[PDB]
Design a protein around this ligand. Structure first.
Ligand SMILES: *O[C@H]1O[C@H](CO)[C@@H](O)[C@H](O)[C@@H]1O
Ligand SMILES: *O[C@H]1O[C@H](CO)[C@@H](O)[C@H](O)[C@@H]1O
Ligand SMILES: *O[C@H]1O[C@H](CO)[C@@H](O)[C@H](O)[C@@H]1O
Length: 36
């Protein structure tokens, strides 16, 4: 997964695309999707 307040998705992101089992994939901005 990715950590809390980490990146699950982005325009130019290159890491885990799954949020933590305590966090969820959500959008903060069209260039940064956060794990909440
Ligand atoms: O997926 C999230 O939890 C994992 C541990 O269960 C971590 O390895 C990962 O990087 C995320 O924090
Ligand atoms: O989840 C934590 O580690 C991640 C990298 O493995 C980061 O993307 C995240 O922001 C946290 O620091
Ligand atoms: O995720 C991939 O692109 C990123 C920059 O947009 C790099 O920082 C990363 O290491 C990967 O190459």
């Amino acid at each position: 997964t990715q950590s809390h307040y980490g990146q699950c998705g982005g325009i130019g992101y290159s890491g885990p695309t799954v949020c933590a089992s305590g966090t969820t994939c959500q959008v903060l901005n069209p260039y940064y999707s956060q794990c909440l």
